[PDB]
RNA sequence: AAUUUCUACUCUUGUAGAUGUGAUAAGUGGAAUGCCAUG
DNA sequence: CATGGCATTCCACTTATCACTAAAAGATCGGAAG
DNA sequence: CTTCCGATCTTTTAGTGAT
């Protein structure tokens, strides 16, 4: 028997807290006199400007090392293909093994242990390889091994700035250490060139050979384009797509060349571009040949390879030089404008335009690749003047039309022919547009230019002027000025001259675009160091004179004290713990052993002395220093810790591979005895009690023992320290003291502290001191950021502040990582069938809506979350989005929307968890991958809502409640754990702890009462013939004289061409055209039954506005127009098909589509509602207007109800799932079968 | 109109809710501009 | 009035690793012994 | 006085986890 409160203290989580530091007294002065702010800023400046120097060494050794790699890829390809053939598990582990094998073989070159190379170069590579991740870089020791990077003296002087400070790069050391590891990390060289680029190359090989065997004609094309691109000149175009050629393509340059081969070199602007492989293949597919139909039947795009890590860009395509400063761009543009003006380009341009009215118009030609732009700009469609010329050339005449379009679309056409086919209205539109363009250009030239562009309006005016400029250029480039056909010599000469005169605006335009779109600089914080190499790396009392960080607690307040190096050295400053009665500070005492698995072998078995001693002789060795008693080390123990093999005999890999569990158990028992002896005899840990441990042979796994052991090591005490001593240490300058501070520690606050502040209070709670649930962690940094009743707006940026970041770990007593968490959740839900369900849906009126249901599907509660603390957030969302797109072409700042995002989502989250703890339910969300929405719904931007899952996940990872008692479940010391750690959206299945994921569609459109939804697709019916075929596909239709409603009876296996193809649970349907009489709700307001809302599409191609409809009244008006008698209950179906005019058929189709339109909404009038045309088995026409709380209130409420029902189905299957597993989503047919089944 | 930071309010010189930092790397998507084609 | 494939720049986003460290080991430096 | 030696300060390091 497990209970809901049992889901706590399951696994550790790690959080970071941020605080502002207030200096206390003279320490603010004394930090300035040492000037550590400027020194640290200079240090950090040296760091980021020296970082690109360092990785050049990494790049150089990577390129040198990889060029010797030579491997067969046949086995890896075979494994990949075999796993592709069928996705059984043992092939997956086979492919995993092959991937690890290839990764290790590639890493062998890096370590210098590869077999294929000789021993001298192997030892050379090893001698290099040990030097990358040490201080050998900074003194240039490894530079002697390379002699290739060849830094200048300024770089060497930069390297001299970090003498005796190499620990600053430890994080960078680890970051680059992830690179050269065969450990399947996504950010690693061998994982990239094994699992990322190589499958792409293999499939590119296979699609190439399929293209070759499909048609051999493009083999000539491919060799031709290789010769044109001039890349890989020493190999065949077949051989490059062969597996042995992947012995190249490891360095960046070959990757770049391959990508250029796929894409093609881009020349400078205004020039023809050399096409690539994908481009020529797309040109082949765009010819609409039967061969293209053969190609369209095949995959038809190569895939570029991923970029090699740490390298740079070395493309052959043209790179435009970028601008530097505002004054540069404005002076360049001012002088360009004055040059253009003094060149009098406008006057000769005007002379060029009016010349057209007094020239032989057939003697001037227009480029065939620009005429469609002119047709679009001067008519309602691009195809207007194209079809005009097409039908003119047709009119002056099967294959003849082909020759006409061939001669038309490719050849440049004289202007007189254009005028003859077009008409003088296009001439007047042309002269109007040219007048507008010349007016814009003249105004832009007359308009001066601002003194900078940091304001948006300056960017606007320059963008407008330069925009008019390249618009004029686009106007100028319309004319086919080439002399292949006739062209007027003086006119062409003046046109070419003026185009060359005003040419470089386009380059000016792109350079201005690149300069203005740069993100503006803002001031940043940087890490403080106080000349401490290891400032606050850890808190331990032994290291506290080296890490230099000491905490104090004073009557509720918190103080962090830093002592610096005095006269360039660590003066041993210490204090005396006085009585608790004495006034003063309470110093924290950090007694901590980091981890048994790393420290015990370090201080015990992997010392230099023991390794030397036991290499010489087999005699056991006694260790004395840092031990109260001489510690025995046996040969056997060293053999277990140093097995000359990957699996240690006490560790579980030995058990998994070997299988001899006896030796595994005995080695484990011996190891536990040894580490118990070590913990007994070691100086730091001899004072700790370990009586809570089980005896040695009872333990199951070593990791279990370690996870048991680690919480015993960590321990905090507190000692009162006299106040005047601390004051004297501060006044001497020997102690820098800050107060840890946030909003909540201010005196003017009352009630509801911030959650992080509540964590901080809970860390130092005496109960947490008794047993450690909240553990303070190491590696804390300090940041300095410079500067940037009536209250001052933006007060917190006015002056410089000292920031403080500190990591803490929650649920310390729990295990390191969760295991079988979903299994535990499924077990609890199996034991509790009575658990409620909460459904979430994204509405159109509401941003989000919630529904609470039981196991019986009864609505406990629905509620609007559209407004929280009486605010409409969708309004601000749409204003911010419209300013985003308005600033997009405006060359403005990009900005962010995500603060308003998470501000609304936080209140949503808080309401969600309040409901969750109140109801002890589960929560169902829609799968983000299996759906699509747009602006018709409120919040539904896919990027917006997908991110909303994330804070839900980690808030449910370590959920606490601010008003709970700290010792209670849901308090600080017992956080609720309900989910697992989020990794990636594509990673988790349908279940994440108590959360559940279901397919989005077929949720809102269904009637809740019986499970009816329209099965008919309506884009099928385009003509009255299809509409007639649709209306004949019906069973029986008659009018109820008693109820005054029109009754349609429908069966499956009819209109299957118009169905959506998903069968329902029952084959019978009885649609009722409800009479549009008045009806009343639960409250008493009248409403019209069957009322529908419909957009306007009367113009047959566009969408209008919304309007009302009364289908029964319009229906009876239609039959009175047709004069067909229907007050008899007779079959109206033969009577309707008698009148075969397309208008009548279209009207009845529209009416029955409208009554099949389940969703009814118009926010302009404010009516969002659901009316079911299909009546109940009780005969009740369902409406959401009835306001029954038993049924959903609104349409989005209906969707939330239905997604809750989907979750109910999924967990009911879990109840039937005896394997404790879950389905891979929910099939739509299964869903509608289920909902129709229990509804009917 | 305040905040470690962010959001919403403003009486409270504050309120309520959220808030894993740092470093590194890669990828994706937009937009603009050119080039070649197609409807 | 758009689409397809490319190329350059700029911006935005996600995604995917590592650390959450006391002590050994080694460098080095200032003051007494030969 | 230089060499050495013991103090002292950076720098690297140690490695678990399912029938």
UniProtKB/Swiss-Prot annotation:
Q: Where is this site: Binds PAM on target DNA?
A: 167, 543
Coiled-coil stretches are 74-106
A Pfam family annotated for this chain is: cas_Cpf1_2nd
Q: Give the recorded use of this protein.
A: This class of CRISPR enzymes recognize a 5' T-rich protospacer adjacent motif (PAM, TTTN for this specific enzyme), unlike Cas9 enzymes which recognize 3' G-rich PAMs, thus this enzyme increases the possibilites for genome editing. When appropriately expressed in a human cell line mediates human genome editing via indel formation; its T-rich PAM sequence may make it useful for engineering of AT-rich genomes or of regions such as scaffold-matrix attachment areas. It has also been engineered to recognize altered PAM sequences, which will enlarge its target scope.
Could you say what the effect of mutating residue 382 to A is? Nearly complete loss of guided indel formation
UniProt site positions, description: Binds crRNA: 18, 192, 805
Region span, REC1 (helical-I): 36-320
Further comment found in the protein's record: Part of a type V-A CRISPR-Cas system.
Assembly and oligomerization: Monomer.
Q: What is this protein's record name?
A: CRISPR-associated endonuclease Cas12a
The coding gene here is: cas12a
């Amino acid at each position: 028997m497990t209970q809901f409160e049992g889901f706590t203290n399951l696994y550790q989580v790690s959080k970071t807290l941020r605080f502002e530091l207030i200096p206390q007294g003279k320490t603010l002065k004394h930090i300035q006199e040492q000037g550590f702010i400027e020194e640290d800023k200079a240090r950090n400046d040296h760091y980021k400007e020296l970082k690109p120097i360092i990785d050049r060494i990494y790049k150089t050794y990577a390129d040198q090392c990889l060029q010797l790699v030579q491997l067969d890829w046949e086995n890896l390809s075979a494994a990949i293909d075999s796993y592709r053939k069928e996705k059984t598990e043992e092939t997956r582990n086979a492919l995993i093994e092959e991937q690890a094998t290839y990764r290790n073989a590639i890493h062998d070159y890096f370590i210098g242990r590869t077999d294929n190379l000789t021993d001298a170069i192997n030892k050379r590579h090893a001698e290099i390889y040990k030097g990358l991740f040490k201080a050998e870089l900074f003194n240039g020791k490894v530079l002697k091994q390379l002699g290739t990077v060849t830094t200048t003296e300024h770089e060497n002087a930069l390297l001299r700035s970090f003498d005796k400070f190499t620990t600053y790069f430890s994080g960078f050391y680890e970051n680059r250490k992830n690179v050269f590891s065969a450990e399947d990390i996504s950010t690693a060289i061998p994982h990239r060139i094994v699992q990322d680029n190589f499958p792409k190359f293999k499939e590119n090989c296979h699609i190439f050979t399929r293209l070759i065997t499909a048609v051999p004609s493009l083999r000539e094309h491919f060799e031709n384009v290789k010769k044109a691109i001039g890349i890989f000149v020493s190999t065949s175009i077949e051989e490059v797509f062969s597996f042995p050629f992947y012995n190249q393509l490891l360095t960046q340059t070959q990757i770049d060349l391959y990508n250029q081969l796929l894409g093609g070199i881009s020349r400078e602007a205004g020039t023809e571009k050399i096409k690539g492989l994908n481009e020529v293949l797309n040109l082949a597919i765009q010819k609409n040949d039967e061969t293209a139909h053969i190609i369209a039947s095949l995959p038809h795009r190569f895939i570029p390879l991923f970029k090699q890590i740490l390298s740079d860009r070395n493309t052959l395509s043209f790179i435009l030089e970028e601008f530097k400063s505002d004054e540069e761009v404005i002076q360049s543009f001012c002088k360009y404008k004055t040059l253009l003006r003094n060149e009098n380009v406008l006057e000769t341009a005007e002379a060029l335009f009016n010349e057209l009215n007094s020239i032989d118009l057939t003697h001037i030609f227009i480029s065939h690749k620009k005429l469609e732009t002119i047709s679009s700009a001067l008519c309602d469609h691009w195809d207007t003047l194209r079809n005009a010329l097409y039908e003119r050339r047709i009119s002056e005449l099967k294959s003849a039309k082909e020759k006409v379009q061939r001669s038309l679309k490719h050849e440049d056409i004289n202007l007189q022919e254009i005028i003859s086919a077009a008409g003088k209205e296009l001439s007047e539109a042309f002269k109007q547009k040219t007048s507008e363009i010349l007016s814009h250009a003249h105004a832009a030239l007359d308009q001066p230019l601002p003194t900078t562009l940091k304001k948006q309006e300056e960017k606007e005016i320059l963008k407008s002027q330069l925009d008019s400029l390249l618009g004029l250029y686009h106007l100028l480039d319309w004319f086919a000025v080439d002399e292949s056909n006739e062209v007027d010599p003086e006119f062409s000469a003046r046109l070419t001259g003026i185009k060359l005169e005003m040419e470089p605006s386009l380059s000016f335009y792109n350079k201005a675009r690149n300069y203005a779109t740069k993100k503006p600089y803002s001031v940043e914080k940087f890490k403080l160091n106080f000349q401490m190499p290891t400032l606050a790396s850890g808190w331990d009392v032994n290291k506290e004179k080296n890490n230099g960080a000491i905490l104090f607690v004073k009557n509720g307040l918190y103080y962090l004290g830093i002592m610096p190096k005095q006269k360039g050295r660590y003066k041993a400053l210490s204090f005396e713990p006085t009585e608790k009665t004495s006034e003063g500070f309470d110093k924290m005492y950090y007694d901590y052993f980091p981890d048994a698995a790393k420290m015990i072998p370090k201080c015990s078995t992997q010392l230099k002395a023991v390794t030397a001693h036991f290499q010489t002789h087999t005699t056991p060795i006694l260790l004395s220093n840092n031990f109260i008693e001489p510690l025995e080390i046996t040969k056997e123990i060293y053999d277990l810790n140093n097995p000359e093999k990957e699996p240690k005999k006490f560790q579980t890999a030995y058990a998994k591979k070997t299988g001899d569990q006896k030796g595994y158990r005995e080695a484990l028992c011996k190891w536990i005895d040894f580490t118990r002896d070590f913990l007994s005899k070691y100086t730091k840990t001899t004072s700790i009690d370990l009586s809570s441990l089980r005896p040695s042979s009872q333990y199951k796994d070593l990791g279990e023992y370690y996870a048991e052991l680690n919480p015993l090591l960590y321990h905090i005490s507190f000692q009162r320290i006299a106040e005047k001593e601390i004051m004297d240490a501060v006044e001497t300058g020997k102690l820098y003291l800050f107060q840890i501070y946030n909003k909540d520690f201010a005196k003017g606050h009352h009630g509801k502290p911030n959650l992080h502040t509540l964590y901080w209070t809970g860390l130092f709670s005496p109960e947490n001191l008794a047993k450690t649930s909240i553990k303070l962690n190491g590696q804390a940094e300090l940041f300095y950021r410079p500067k940037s009743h009536e209250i001052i707006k933006d007060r917190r940026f006015t002056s410089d502040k000292f920031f403080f970041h500190v990591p803490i770990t929650l649920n310390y007593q729990a295990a390191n990582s969760p295991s079988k968490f979903n299994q535990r959740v499924n077990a609890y839900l199996k034991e509790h069938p009575e658990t409620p369900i909460i459904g979430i849906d994204r509405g159109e009126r509401n941003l989000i809506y919630i529904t609470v249901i039981d196991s019986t599907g009864k609505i406990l509660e629905q509620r609007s979350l559209n407004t929280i603390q009486q605010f409409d957030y969708q309004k601000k969302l749409d204003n911010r989005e419209k300013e985003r797109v308005a600033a997009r072409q405006a060359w403005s700042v990009v900005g962010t929307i995500k603060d308003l995002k998470q501000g609304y989502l936080s209140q949503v989250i808080h309401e969600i968890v309040d409901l969750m703890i109140h109801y002890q339910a589960v929560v169902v969300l829609e799968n983000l991958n299996f759906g699509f929405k747009s602006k018709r719904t409120g919040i539904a931007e896919k990027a917006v809502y997908q991110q909303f899952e994330k804070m839900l996940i980690d808030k449910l990872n370590c959920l606490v409640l601010k008003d709970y008692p700290a010792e209670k479940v849901g308090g600080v010391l017992n956080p609720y754990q309900l989910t697992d750690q989020f990794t990636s959206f594509a990673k988790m299945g349908t279940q994440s702890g108590f959360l559940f994921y279901v397919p989005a569609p077929y949720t809102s459109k269904i009637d809740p009462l019986t499970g009816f939804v329209d099965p008919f697709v309506w884009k099928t019916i385009k003509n009255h013939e299809s509409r007639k075929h649709f209306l004949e596909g019906f069973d029986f239709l008659h009018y109820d004289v008693k109820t005054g409603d029109f009754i349609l009876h429908f069966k499956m296996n009819r209109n299957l061409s118009f169905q959506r193809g998903l069968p329902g649970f029952m084959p019978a349907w009885d649609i009722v055209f409800e009479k549009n009489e008045t009806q009343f709700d639960a409250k008493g307001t009248p409403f019209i039954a069957g009322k529908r809302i419909v957009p306007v599409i009367e113009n047959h191609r566009f969408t209008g506005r919304y309007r009302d409809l009364y289908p029964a009244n319009e229906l009876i008006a239609l039959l009175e127009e047709k004069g067909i008698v229907f007050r008899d209950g007779s079959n109206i179906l033969p009577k309707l098909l008698e009148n075969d005019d397309s208008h009548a058929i279209d009207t009845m189709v529209a009416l029955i589509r409208s009554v099949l339109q389940m969703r009814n909404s118009n926010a302009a009038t404010g009516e969002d509602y659901i009316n079911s045309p299909v009546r109940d088995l009780n005969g009740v026409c369902f409406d959401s207007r009835f306001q029954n709380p038993e049924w959903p209130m609104d349409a989005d409420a209906n969707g939330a109800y239905h997604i809750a029902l989907k979750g109910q189905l999924l967990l009911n299957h879990l109840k039937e799932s005896k394997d404790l597993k879950l389905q891979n989503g929910i099939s739509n047919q299964d869903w509608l079968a289920y909902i129709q089944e229990l509804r009917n």
